[PDB]
Every structure is written in structure tokens, then in C-alpha cells.
Design an enzyme around this catalytic site. Structure first.
Site, PDB file in Angstrom:
ATOM      1  N   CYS A 434       0.823  -1.200   0.000  1.00 50.45           N
ATOM      2  CA  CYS A 434       0.000   0.000   0.000  1.00 50.45           C
ATOM      3  C   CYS A 434       0.859   1.252   0.000  1.00 50.45           C
ATOM      4  O   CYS A 434       0.798   2.063  -0.927  1.00 50.45           O
ATOM      5  CB  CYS A 434      -0.933   0.002   1.212  1.00 50.45           C
ATOM      6  SG  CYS A 434      -2.096  -1.339   1.160  1.00 50.45           S
ATOM      7  N   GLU A 436       4.097   0.945   1.819  1.00 49.68           N
ATOM      8  CA  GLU A 436       5.168   0.453   2.681  1.00 49.68           C
ATOM      9  C   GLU A 436       6.535   0.803   2.105  1.00 49.68           C
ATOM     10  O   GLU A 436       6.922   0.323   1.033  1.00 49.68           O
ATOM     11  CB  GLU A 436       5.035  -1.050   2.925  1.00 49.68           C
ATOM     12  CG  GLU A 436       3.793  -1.473   3.722  1.00 49.68           C
ATOM     13  CD  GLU A 436       2.591  -1.868   2.858  1.00 49.68           C
ATOM     14  OE1 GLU A 436       1.636  -1.066   2.763  1.00 49.68           O
ATOM     15  OE2 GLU A 436       2.599  -2.976   2.273  1.00 49.68           O
TER      16      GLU A 436
HETATM   17  O1  LIG Z   1      -3.224  -7.288   1.209  1.00 48.16           O
HETATM   18  C1  LIG Z   1      -2.668  -6.705   2.118  1.00 48.16           C
HETATM   19  O2  LIG Z   1      -3.177  -6.540   3.216  1.00 48.16           O
HETATM   20  C2  LIG Z   1      -1.309  -6.237   1.861  1.00 48.16           C
HETATM   21  C3  LIG Z   1      -0.593  -6.007   3.165  1.00 48.16           C
HETATM   22  C4  LIG Z   1       0.170  -4.742   2.967  1.00 48.16           C
HETATM   23  O3  LIG Z   1       1.177  -4.977   2.016  1.00 48.16           O
HETATM   24  C5  LIG Z   1      -0.768  -3.962   2.148  1.00 48.16           C
HETATM   25  N1  LIG Z   1      -1.360  -4.953   1.312  1.00 48.16           N
END
Ligand SMILES: O=C(O)[C@@H]1C[C@@H](O)CN1
EC number: 4.2.1.172
Length: 789
Positions: A434, A436
Site C-alpha cells: 500500500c 510500505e
Molecule cells: O493485502 C494486504 O493486506 C497487503 C498487506 C500490505 O502490504 C498492504 N497490502
């Protein structure tokens, strides 16, 4: 006509969006064959590599019609492999995921029978999930079941990493040569770790062999398919695929076309080696492709259109790979098919100068044309970024499907350096998933789960008792009716936070051990920096940088909730704690006076109001201090990031009413965005509020902003968007992404979802089809503040 600049990419895109999400059991079958053959005879890393090699050697392989970049995770587009070594589904899991309303996966009867008869009997006891759950404490199980936090590694491998530049400079034959040099130099006399280094390195060598087998097999298949292809133009495409696969992934790519194919092969590899979070991404794709682009145009084998066509093919390839099926809490926290393949276009080049190049604009054109929610195609904006590139990015963002997100290059660089990255390595960095932040190709920055910060406030208010699960989830920090000052409640809150973070980290340590021992990733290790040199798997700390994150959810909700208490209970004394808890227990029924006070007559986060924003800072710092610096098992440190995916829905669902006015079971706030109804002073007020959060001390923060479509029109809108991004980034804001939608289109989309299958909105760090979201999540997006300039 539709979408796609060329016929080819129109067709591939059409095939992509029509692919039905289903499970491909072949990987599980092949991994079971390999284990039954090798389990017990080799170390677990070698076992993983041999299984991957056995899988790559025997998996069916598909070249879709008209493809230029080849390779699928599963049997066909949107065919998700299963990962019974991580999560061995029960037959009810197969039932649930087949029949659920959103984020379903079709389980063919052939897959179901195989899973019941071949997979479950072998993997039910071996899956890491049971290893994890059986190793968890009672207090962890209670807190996990109560929704205090989530566990990222129950159904997925840590993953969450980004390709660096190794795969464009080296082939896997070259990487095998590097690994063989490490093996020859391992000192078993003095290096007491040499055995573990040998096992990991031997495993990586097999992964290199597997990557080489993957290219040979695809080139053979392409040539073989060219022999029966009667269309001269398609035959030439297949011959170009074969020529490409003769080079990659065994040798370094020599052409722009080959650079892309190399990436996607590596992508397929690491993403079928393990069900890794955030799939994979090329990271700074424009930086990596541009030397190939310039070298190819000067040599006349490539032009801007062929460059764009190839990237549009790559875009489709991303869109064909769903995040493999999730169940239970993992579905709740990541309720999406997307796998967060986050691409960073723009930013700075390795030398720290403006990185926008010709491929930067090609990428912008590709994401604009393709309008695919995978990959997550975003832009990094530096203070060095030419305004044309930022404005062009706003041209795409204002079209209202969320992408691109905007990342602050200087924030990214500083966050990386704050985490200990060199400026040289930070300049190669960016964001993935997202929001990160990571040093691409050189870091394991593992997310371990969402932390329900508002529910920790709830436990605080109930002396450790969870009124939802009706269990004693937290500790006895005191009856808040006895707290004589806000500070004392906030201290009680930190104590609950400490206890809950303690439970989470303790489980993570056990989990990190399980992933290190039971989920080694030799393939990922070959391309991530320092793993080969260290002889240490990426999963046990081979990356140059190692961070773990607990992603804090609901900072807005809890900020406003603590602000409501500071303002109303202690400051203005409009009501006391006992009344507030009675109101909360009643879901504010019979306390309309209190509900109005906390919703409309109390300072709110996201208005540049220091009274609320300082509370946000205290909470965020309390979170940062509670987590940051804690050692990870493999020699790294915990850090903090703020991002929810869909977990702000779940975290709200299993939470009662909160002091800010939020009702029982209602979502908590998303990212670092204001609480629902909290920001009443326009976007400049929110970016100023959000900038008061010390983004540099995080591994990323997620800011959602929504604009009324009218105010983004024309050059005035572009300039206003560009200024807002720059104004937020000038204050070291980390990330901003925009919703630009008509509320009525979404309201109609709820009523007649079949009429709006196209409709893409921005959720949290990603774009999704509106129809894939639960009613609760749809209404959450709709409830986001329509900002005007
Ligand atoms: O699908 C998720 O939750 C991942 C976790 C973080 O990378 C944000 N997206």
C-alpha cells in the site's frame, strides 16, 4: 475499441478481466509429490528449492493468445495456486471461498477431490498455520479471536519485498555462478554457521536451476507453438517470445523486451515459491527499463510504441495474478483479489537526480490506457520532479480510479535512512504494497499484522474486559471512572497497548521462527541483496535490511475518541467517564446529547487543530515507541507503519461504540485519514494535520483524500492537485492518493452492481472494483469527505 493501445494489448486485457477467479490445485499436487519424494532427506531450505524445481519442471505452462510477456502463476489467468504448506484448507474453506459473495474463488470438483484426498491427508499436519496456532499462547488466541490484532503469516508467507536491479544486470546462470562461488568459499572450519549457509546456498542454486528450467521450457513451448501456428504474425510473436526466453531468465536481459520478460519470470517464480504478501513488483521500473529503452531505440529495434505495447502486456500479466485465496481473518484484513504489486514511477535515479525519463511517461500512458487495478501503478514525486510529470500523474489520478498514488520521494529516502539505510541504498528505495517504504532489492520489510489501536482504547475503558467477546482480553489497568486526569487514562491506554503489543510481538517471534525454519525462500534470496553474500535465506535475515512492521489501524478513530474524552470528560466536563461508558454500552441509544457533543462539538483530527492533532501525535508516538526498536528474531528491528487495507472494517466490526461518536460495529478510520465526518475544513487542513504525524519515523502512512469531481477539472484542477501533493510532500507527508468519484454513481452501483462492473474506487493503498467490497466497506468509502479546493 475499448482499452489497450494496440490490438494485442486490447485482447490480452479483455482476456484478463474476463478470467474467472479459481484455484489451481496443480501447485499443491506437485509440491506434495516433491515432499513425498524428498521430505526427510534434505534440509528444509533445500526441500523448498527441490519442490519449487520439481514444480517448475512439471507444471503446465501457458502462452495466452497474443502475449509478448509470458508466464502465469496458476493454470490460467486469475487461477490462484494453493499453498497447503502455509494454509492447508479444510473442505469447509473450499466451500466458503467457493460460495462467498465477495472475493470468491471457484473450486472445481477436480480441485476439491484432489485437495480432500491428496492434499489434506498430507498437509493438514504439516501446514505452518497449525504450527503457528498450536504454538500461540492463550492470551494471544483470545486477543486474535477478539480482533485485537491480525496475523499476517497464518495464511501467507512474509514476502512483502520488491525487485532491485540484480535481475537486469545478471541472469540466473550468473546468479548460480555467484552462489557456487559462495559455496566454494564457505569455511567449515571456522564459520560455525557454514552448515546453514551451505543449506541456504545449495537451495538458492536449485532455485537458479529452476529459473533456468523455466526459461528453457517456455522457449521450447514458444518454438513448439510456433511450429503449429498458421498465422505468420502470431508465429513471429512466438519466435520473439522464444528469442526472449533463450536469454531470460538464464542470462541477463539485453533488450527492453527481455528486461520485462526477465522481471515477469522472476515474478512468477517468487510468487509461486510461496504465497508471499504483496506478490512482487519491479519497483523502480522506469529506472530499470530506461537504459534498455535508450539502447534499443538507438539501435533501432524498439520505438516508443513497441515500448508501450510491451508494458501494456506486462500490466495485463499483473492483472492475471490474484492474491491466492484467503479465509478467516486474513480475508477480513485483506478482502481483495489484488496482490499489491506496487510500481514506483518517477522519483529519483540512483544518483539522486530527477528520475523522470522517457519510460516514466510510457508507464504513465500504460496505466492510463490499461486502467487495471493490478499492478498498483503509482508515482514517486520528488522536489526534483518536473511539474509536467506530476501534472500528468494528476491527469490520471483525477480520472477517479485511484491510481496513481503519490509517494513523497524525499520522505521515502528519509524514512529509509531513519531505518538505517545508506543514502546510496535509500535512493534505490520506494514504497510497496500500500504505502510500505522499503529499500527495493535489499530489504525484508515484513508486515506482521494490523493492530486494533481503537480496540485497545476500548479495553482500556473496560479495565481490560472486551465487551464484544465478553472475555478478559487485556489487563486490569483500572476502572476509568477512577481516573482523575486525561493523562492517567492515556497512561492506562499505553499499558493496554504495551500488553497487547507484547502479546503480538511474542507471537510474532514464534511465527518469525516458524517462517524462517519452515518457509525458506531460496528463489527470492537469489535476487535480494545480501542473501547470496551472507549465505542466508531471505526468510531468516539474508536481506541487507530487515524490518518488521505492525501496521497501526484506526489512528483517526482513536485520536478523536481520546480527544472526545480529553475534551468532554476532563476538560469541559460535559459528562463523566461513567456516563460515557453507559453511552458506549448503549450504542449511544438514550445518550443523543453525548453523541452530538462528541461528534460535532469536540475537536476532531484532520482540521489543523492542534488540540486533536497533538492527541494524534501522542497516540502515534506511543505506538511508535511501543513497537519501534523491538528486535526481530533474525537480527532486524520492528518499525511502525499506518495503513489498514480492509482491516479497518473488521477492526470496527468487532469493536463496540467508541468515545468519538463511532457506533458499535462501524468501521474504524482508514489509514491516517480523518475519522468519518472528522475533517470539515478542506484538504489543506487535513494534509497539515497528517503532516504532524512523523512520517519519517515510519515505514509509511496512508492518506486517502477524495475530491468532488468538479474541482479537478482542467488546468486549474491539475494545478490544485499538484499543489496539494507538493504542499503535503513539502511538509514530509508520505503518501496521498485520491478518490474522484460521483457519490451517486457508487450509490447506484450498490443498487445495481451488475451495471457497474467497471467501477473502480480507491480503497486503501490500492484500487479495487467497487462490487468486490462489502456493503460496510462501500459505505466507508462513500463516507469519506468530499473535499473541494
Ligand atoms: O493485502 C494486504 O493486506 C497487503 C498487506 C500490505 O502490504 C498492504 N497490502
Amino acid at each position: 475499441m475499448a482499452r489497450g493501445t494496440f490490438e494485442r494489448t486490447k485482447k490480452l486485457r479483455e482476456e484478463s478481466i474476463n478470467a474467472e477467479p479459481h484455484i489451481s490445485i496443480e501447485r499443491a499436487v506437485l509440491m506434495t509429490e516433491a515432499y513425498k519424494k524428498y521430505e526427510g532427506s534434505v534440509e528444509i531450505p533445500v526441500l523448498r528449492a527441490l519442490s519449487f524445481k520439481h514444480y517448475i519442471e512439471n507444471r503446465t505452462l501457458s502462452i495466452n493468445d497474443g502475449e509478448l510477456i509470458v508466464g502465469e502463476k496458476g493454470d490460467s489467468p486469475n487461477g490462484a495456486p494453493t499453498y497447503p504448506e502455509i494454509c492447508c484448507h479444510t473442505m469447509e474453506d473450499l466451500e466458503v471461498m467457493h460460495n462467498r459473495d465477495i472475493i470468491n474463488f471457484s473450486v472445481s470438483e477436480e480441485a476439491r477431490k484432489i485437495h480432500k484426498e491428496e492434499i489434506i491427508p498430507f498437509w493438514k499436519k504439516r501446514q505452518t498455520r497449525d504450527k503457528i496456532i498450536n504454538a500461540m499462547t492463550p492470551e494471544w488466541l483470545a486477543a486474535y479471536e477478539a480482533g485485537m490484532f491480525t496475523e499476517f503469516m497464518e495464511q501467507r508467507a512474509p514476502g512483502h519485498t520488491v525487485c532491485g536491479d540484480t535481475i537486469y544486470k545478471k541472469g540466473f546462470l550468473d546468479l548460480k555462478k555467484d552462489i557456487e562461488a559462495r559455496l566454494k568459499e564457505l569455511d567449515f572450519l571456522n564459520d560455525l554457521d557454514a552448515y546453514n549457509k551451505k543449506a541456504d546456498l545449495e537451495a538458492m542454486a536449485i532455485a537458479c536451476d529452476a529459473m533456468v528450467i523455466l526459461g528453457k521450457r517456455y522457449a521450447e513451448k514458444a518454438r513448439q507453438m510456433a511450429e503449429e501456428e498458421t498465422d505468420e504474425a502470431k508465429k513471429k510473436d512466438l519466435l520473439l517470445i522464444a528469442e526472449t526466453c533463450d536469454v531470460v531468465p538464464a542470462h541477463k536481459p539485453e533488450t527492453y523486451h527481455q528486461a520485462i520478460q526477465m522481471y515477469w519470470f522472476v515474478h512468477i517464480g517468487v510468487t509461486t515459491e510461496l504465497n508471499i504478501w504483496d506478490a512482487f513488483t519491479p519497483g523502480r521500473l522506469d529506472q530499470h527499463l530506461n537504459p534498455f529503452y535508450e539502447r534499443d531505440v538507438e539501435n533501432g529495434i524498439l520505438d516508443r510504441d513497441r515500448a508501450q505495447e510491451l508494458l501494456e502486456c506486462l500490466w495485463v500479466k499483473f492483472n492475471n495474478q490474484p492474491a491466492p485465496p484467503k479465509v478467516g481473518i486474513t480475508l477480513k484484513e485483506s478482502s481483495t483479489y489484488t496482490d499489491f504489486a506496487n510500481i514506483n514511477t518517477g522519483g529519483i535515479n540512483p544518483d539522486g537526480q530527477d528520475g523522470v525519463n522517457e519510460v516514466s511517461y510510457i508507464i504513465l500512458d500504460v496505466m492510463d490506457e490499461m486502467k487495471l487495478i493490478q499492478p498498483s501503478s503509482n508515482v514517486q514525486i520528488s522536489k526534483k520532479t518536473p511539474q509536467k510529470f506530476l501534472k500528468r500523474a494528476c491527469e490520471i489520478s483525477r480520472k477517479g480510479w485511484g491510481q496513481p498514488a503519490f509517494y513523497n520521494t524525499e520522505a521515502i529516502v528519509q524514512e529509509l535512512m531513519e531505518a538505517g539505510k545508506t543514502i546510496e541504498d535509500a535512493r534505490l528505495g520506494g514504497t510497496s504494497g500500500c504505502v510500505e517504504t522499503g529499500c527495493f532489492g535489499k530489504e525484508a520489510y515484513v508486515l506482521t499484522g494490523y493492530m486494533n489501536i481503537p480496540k485497545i482504547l476500548e479495553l482500556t475503558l473496560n479495565n481490560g474486559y472486551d465487551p464484544i467477546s465478553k472475555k478478559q482480553i487485556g489487563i486490569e489497568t483500572g476502572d476509568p471512572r477512577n481516573f482523575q486526569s486525561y493523562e492517567e487514562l492515556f497512561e492506562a491506554f499505553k499499558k493496554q497497548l504495551h500488553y497487547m503489543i507484547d502479546i503480538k510481538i511474542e507471537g510474532n517471534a514464534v511465527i518469525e521462527n516458524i517462517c524462517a525454519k519452515h518457509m525458506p525462500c531460496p528463489l527470492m534470496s537469489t535476487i535480494v541483496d545480501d542473501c547470496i553474500e551472507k549465505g542466508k535465506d531471505y526468510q531468516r535475515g539474508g536481506a541487507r535490511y530487515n524490518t518488521r512492521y505492525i501496521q497501526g489501524v484506526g489512528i483517526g478513530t482513536i485520536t478523536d475518541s481520546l480527544t472526545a474524552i480529553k475534551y468532554n470528560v476532563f476538560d469541559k466536563k460535559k459528562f463523566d467517564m461513567d456516563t460515557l461508558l453507559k453511552a458506549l454500552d448503549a450504542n449511544f441509544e438514550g445518550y443523543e446529547a453525548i453523541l452530538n457533543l462528541v461528534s460535532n462539538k469536540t475537536p476532531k483530527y484532520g482540521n489543523d487543530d492542534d488540540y486533536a492533532d497533538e492527541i494524534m501525535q501522542e497516540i502515534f508516538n506511543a505506538y511508535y515507541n511501543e513497537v519501534t526498536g523491538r528486535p526481530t528474531v533474525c537480527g532486524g528491528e520492528y518499525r511502525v507503519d499506518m495503513l489498514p487495507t480492509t482491516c479497518h472494517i473488521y477492526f470496527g466490526e468487532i469493536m463496540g461504540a467508541s468515545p468519538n461518536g463511532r457506533l458499535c460495529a462501524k468501521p474504524v478510520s482508514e489509514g491516517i485519514s480523518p475519522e468519518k465526518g472528522g475533517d470539515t475544513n478542506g484538504p489543506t487542513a487535513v494534509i497539515k494535520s497528517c503532516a504532524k504525524m512523523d512520517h519519517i519515523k515510519t515505514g509509511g502512512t496512508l492518506l486517502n483524500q477524495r475530491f468532488a469531481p468538479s474541482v479537478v477539472q482542467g488546468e486549474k484542477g491539475l494545478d490544485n492537485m499538484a499543489n496539494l501533493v507538493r504542499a503535503y510532500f513539502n511538509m514530509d507527508g508520505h503518501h496521498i492518493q485520491f478518490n474522484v468519484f460521483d457519490k451517486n454513481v457508487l450509490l447506484e452501483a450498490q443498487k445495481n452492481p451488475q451495471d457497474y462492473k467497471d467501477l473502480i474506487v480507491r480503497v486503501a493503498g490500492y484500487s479495487d472494483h467497487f462490487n468486490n467490497l462489502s456493503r460496510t466497506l462501500q459505505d466507508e468509502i462513500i463516507g469519506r469527505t468530499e473535499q473541494t479546493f
